Symmetry: D6
Subunit: 169 residues, 12 copies
């Protein structure tokens, strides 16, 4: 149930993230190349530490087991928008967590960071991750055509958004 | 027209860019804040020197007028895409230059850089710029709702794109 | 009047800045020690170019005479507040310039930086700075008791503020 | 009671500071984003190591349990003024400890740092903390309108202060 | 069989890479001096950590025995071309493993890196490796005369290649 | 003719180099993007001075007009091979210069650097580069299928070579 | 006199200071060895740039004569004290300048810097300088026995001071 | 008895010094602020290592127990004077050591370092530490008025001196 | 017998080399001063790592015991010559290894590195190390007169050479 | 007897060197302040690591007890001259060891460093050390008046020397 | 002749050296590749600044002609030996300068540097240079077989030397 | 005479220094190799500014002609000794200058730096340097046998000295 908590990504967490980062089947849905030496990782972690344009979160339960990773990135502070990215680890999918976690990100985006808009990309051939975002109040503002090469072909993604005045009320 | 040339942006060009970069009715169109020390610009230009992820171009004519600037930014070499942007210096607009300028950018994109997709963002409330793009072959693929805060209001823009296939088989 | 504009602070402006920063009866109303090497200015200018939390502006008349300094400082992007501070050069005071430049500060804050609150500090013994701010919409939120030592004694300053919504719809 | 020591924050207090710097409830009262990786904290500590403009104090009891933090920040040596802030650890709340930590930081400010004015900022929605300050001699000098965005709303804050002659006479 | 994983080379694979980089017999087939102190390898690894122009893969089996190395080097993102090379460990030779490592690196090149052409260089004196490549779809495009000095004599090499449409159609 | 000489590439030659490196219909036959800041040239020149694996040469006529560029690159000292690449400035082509400068490349490679093999890459759609190399002794060792994207398409290049012994005793 | 001004020491002033710094009958009075490379002075000046613990001031008159130098050094912000020192260039002494100069230093000390105690060291054998100080309100608080080796002899000096209270209520 | 020895301050000694440095009741008599992170300490130790203008000594007995700290600072080599500072740790006061230690400092100053004058400051409200220095041949050359803010008020210190020609003979 | 192998000098090997480097009786025959701190060594090892003009080898047997050190230095790549240096450790002399090892160096020089000439220096009062080199196909091209001060006097060395075309065939 | 080895000073001899560098009695004979933190010694060692103008030797016996230090400093390679100094450890004094350490450093200077003159400086108040030097062949060439301040008085020193031809003939 | 002087090579001399360093029939004689950026030369000169193991000298006459260059390199201070090399600029040869120049080098070597043995390498096929050396007192000590690849052939050289004893007792 | 003064060594003095430092028959009596780049001078000057253990002085006549160099080196602040070394420019020797400048060395050492002993080294084959030192109070404390190689041989030098007390009361 609602035992799930969001926390700041830490150095101790990089092995878990290193694993997700090299998983082809997971990183495809973030349109990120599945190749990352732990060293390269450690370093880009060191980079993200002094960077106000991102916030990375590790998602845990009460055993303190790593359940997943929410990211808010490209925070832009004139326009007050950021890009949202979510992964739940293989052994923690299916359990109905995504709503909770996706909503905590929004709570974060809108009640703390005081952003106007969250947006995201997802593959049009993820027709059910799409149902999800829509259930959480996201809607499609874009159908981006052949945006990303994923698994041997150019694919379509939807861009989806939610604003602060919607989520608040 | 057939006399406009695109060349890599140089250090001797940074006063031209500074001015553009600090002008309110020009930066609005790129969604970029109109404020930049010549000292910030120069340093950014030196880190730009190092970036394979961008090509910033300056636009000249016959007798050396700097007419404008074209960029291909966020060039991604797996997905083979880049964002395109353009400026015609205030004193050079409304001469039918843009058309030729957008079309030099695509030919660069697609005949040298060998990209697959150029995309651009343009204000819904910039309907002249929208109609240019459409007449060069850009089609809308998204209606970004209230994406930018510009001149005191959150504003919608169109995402548009064109593919390498369509340009070469134009 | 309609002539007047703010632009980014440049390196060739530092002589004019330095002049003002060693002026006692000027520096006194910014609560600032009137002591600064041209060299400490240059380093501190190099420091604060990159500093996203600040914007410094020189004002120019139609003939590009340096008229004053407008600054928006401590800009926080979560709370969307920043502190405003201005100086008009001694030889340009008493012209009716003040409201125009305050208005430009607020324009930039609210239509470009998309801020929610702008605040300032003004000495309780500088009435007619206090009174110009009033006529631009600033209201007192606090009386800071004995806040700064200036000219041999601890003096009281007003904290005053204006919101985005009020500015943009009055 | 007199069983509370204040002392300089050391590297070994950082796990403790970190945990507090990621508690949203605690950090709310400080007008403060509840996100801080350990590495970022240790870089900030390494920095203020050399800021004569700031002092950070851990509170300890007799047995030397870590009760809290007290800070004097923005110390100004022309104007002789600094901002005071205090956290007590959730676990050590409500034992009538805070008045002692306050008179402690005041005594440091006035009897050692030879300061002239201490101010603080406290939520208008926290009339119990305001009460607290009033008992230790703090005088409201401002009511800042919508100064901070906290928890989805812009809120008001009391700025308050105390002077050296008042605390020492 | 499908029991072979490819993954990014990590710091803990370096003793293994080192041992291979000092085997003259193995390194002969790579046109390559068989001398490399560990420190020099770790400096080279530290370097390519940040070369988007190269990818290095260790091969693992189910039990996660280190079978070999596969590399895509000189990746060019205008021309969309890279050089392929493969080592299998002496101890894991001759178990019909190489065809799988090859189709593996091809699939990475073509399905993830979205490359256009892969080439390799193979000894004209190694008609068994050439055979190997031919079965996985590689076409001889050059016969380089006396290209490399190996073992006291200047020898010829086949340059061969495969294209994306061919591997994916 | 007998006038022509190669010498080390110098800093005061970079204007002439830069010119050539932003030339499209020149850069196309070196398989190289025609985009390069004067500043990226200068850094890359600073890079490659020390680089023992390369030698870059400017050619001069009897009057010290910059005639072209000769380069020997990837020089490996175990295998004793290097890649050769040349450019004659547009305003000096069609003079009969080509063989003299190829001959100088080979002279340097074989009598100074003591190389065993020199190879080049030439476009299969640049016949008369292919044919000049033949007359200097270069023979085809390979046909690289669809090797480079140039001018909107993947093109085939010839790999060609000449050995030390053949050069020095024919 | 009423025309002498104190300003922060600048880089353009370091030849004036160099000369003073190398003059035997001027440095004796500060107990400082008369030997300094312009190169040492400049570097010290750059580290001085960074020091909140000091204010070095230059003394001008109406028509830009550099008359001297005033320092407040070892400024301590808990104990709120600083050492004061002064020089009048040889050619400007005996004009009754010192008096005004010592009194600009104290007013700076006590009206801006908000210090509590200025102190100074002066040679027992400099009884003119002693009498100046006493007439500005400095009183002796110590007789330092043989503190400095100056001109071949260990020598006594007077420590003198004045407090903020006494200056403001002068 | 005269088992007490003076030695060079070392890195291993910094915990003992760290303790003395944060003791309000001890550092008041050196007019030094009682606040010092171990890190700041470590660093200023690293600084004092390449500094010919100071010598710091740890004072030990035969158990090798840390008994105290003598310092000679601002050694000035034209004028041949330095400032002397002494602390004996809390558990080692009362035992009559100060004379010994103060005299070893002088032996150091005058028989080794070849200084002409040692001077010191002490609070006029330390009327007995004053008797001490006087017993060791120090005399007052100054009564410095309101020099230091200590424990909530400006206080007077005496300056006291001894010369080489006196101590020798 | 021919169990002896040549390998790249490594960091783990520096204690063994440190020993040989400080041995007066060994280093005399290399005309190198017998004085070298392990630190200086470590550093000049770090130097030789990014240096294409040398190759240093540790010579081992099958116990993996360190038997000796072959060096090829001043590799010059226009002229295709290098200087050869050999030491067998004290407890491994007399066993008849030198021929093997000297020949592996040549194999290295001529079959791998593709050099035209190997040369060496040896003291004329080493009349038997000279017989050796001559047995391995080296001949004297020089008798260098009073070249080196060794053990209290200027001494003569022979320079000796072998070329690639000789050794090959 | 012949049971004394000289060798280069290593990092592990530093505790030993340090202890000697803080003995006032020992350091007196070297004209030398007896104060040196360990960190300062290790920085000085790290420095001279690269000074071809100096050589430092620990003395060891058979069992490898650390007997002392010997140094050749200020080696000048135009003039071929260096200064010699020797310490024996208090614990190893008076066993007729010093003559052997002296002829040892002379032999290094003359038979290895090919130097021309060695000099030393020895207290005029130490006629037993002077005796020592005279027996090993050192000739007084100066009587330096009040050259050093040691122990509260300015004292005289003998500068002495020996030449290469004299030591080797 | 008695008017030739040797002085340390300076930064103002590096164009003279550059030219020499890039000339084929001059570098052959030193066995050194004829190719060097002025930028490489300058940097080498700055690391040369630091080297006790070398002395590079420039050769002037009466009226400031730069006639040449002399080096003593690989100076070894235990073995007390150095390699000597020499160049006379093309336009200054065949004037009987060399003799005096070789003999200034030895006197430096042996009267100041206090070396024991100077040695040199010279091409067997440079028999004029061989005869110079022999007439100054150099005698052969080795016949280095095919040591250098020069002008397309591996070539033999003579190692020659002279000792301090023989020069001073000349 | 009374004209002559010593002042700190400055950067604009280095041409004059360099001149002297490459002079053989000058450098010989400082036991110093006459070889030094202007660039090694500049670095070594940058080195030794900060070096508290040395003071270098140029002497000037009444018209600011560089007359010579006076140095006090190895200044140790425990033992309070330093080594003295002087040069008068060749074109200013034989004027009777020597004692004045030695006297200035001692004045500075004893009345400013508060030294106890000043020593020098002088060649036993430079009598009249030996004799001028005598007349300034220097007495021999040692005869250094074969101390330096100079001009083809090992030569003997005198070590000579003068104490503070003797200088200051004779």
């Amino acid at each position: 149930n609602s035992q799930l908590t969001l926390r700041a990504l830490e150095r101790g967490d990089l092995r878990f993230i290193h694993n997700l980062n090299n998983n082809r089947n997971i990183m495809s849905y973030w349109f990120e190349e599945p190749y990352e030496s732990f060293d390269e990782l450690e370093e880009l972690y060191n980079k993200h530490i002094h960077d106000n344009a991102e916030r990375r979160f590790v998602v845990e339960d009460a055993q303190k087991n790593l359940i997943g990773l929410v990211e808010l990135i490209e925070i832009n502070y004139i326009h007050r928008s950021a890009e949202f990215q979510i992964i739940i680890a293989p052994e923690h999918q299916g359990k109905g967590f995504a709503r909770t976690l996706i909503n905590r990100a929004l709570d974060y985006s809108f009640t703390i960071l005081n952003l106007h808009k969250i947006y995201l990309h997802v593959a049009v051939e993820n027709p059910k991750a799409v149902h999800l975002y829509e259930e959480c109040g996201f809607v499609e503002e874009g159908h981006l055509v052949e945006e990303f090469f994923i698994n041997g072909r150019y694919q379509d993604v939807k861009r989806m958004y939610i604003l602060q005045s919607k989520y608040l009320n």
